[PDB]
Amino acid sequence: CKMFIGGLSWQTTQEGLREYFGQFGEVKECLVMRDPLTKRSRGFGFVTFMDQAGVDKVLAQSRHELDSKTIDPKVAFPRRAQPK
RNA sequence: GUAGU
Incomplete structure (x- = not known):
């Protein structure tokens, strides 16, 4: 996911x-x-699901929209979370 | 208003 x-x-x-x-x-x-000074979102983020079945639905749907803006969700390039 | 660890 x-x-x-x-x-x-x-x-x-x-x-x-x-x-x-x-x-x-x-x-x-x-x-x-x-950005922590200007609070601008840079127009992007990330989301993880508790199962792949939620990823499948987000790929299978042809369009998404949040705050009246067309969003572009896709599979994430692999990375490793860091402990703190 | 588009790439993070």
């Missing part, structure tokens, strides 16, 4: 991602790659 989420609004948050992505399955993780 795990997906990159492009085309977001500058008003989108990772709680707002969970609010939209909870329609396809329970999310295991959500992120928005925002």
Whole structure:
């Protein structure tokens, strides 16, 4: 599982991602790659599902939209989470 | 308003 989420609004948050992505399955993780000085979302983030069956639905649907902006969700390039 | 560990 795990997906990159492009085309977001500058008003989108990772709680707002969970609010939209909870329609396809329970999310295991959500992120928005925002600037900490200007609070701009950069127009993108990430979401992980508790099962692949939520990833399957997000790929199978032809269009997505959050805060009146067309979003572009896709399979995430592999990475390793760091402990803290 | 589009690539993170």
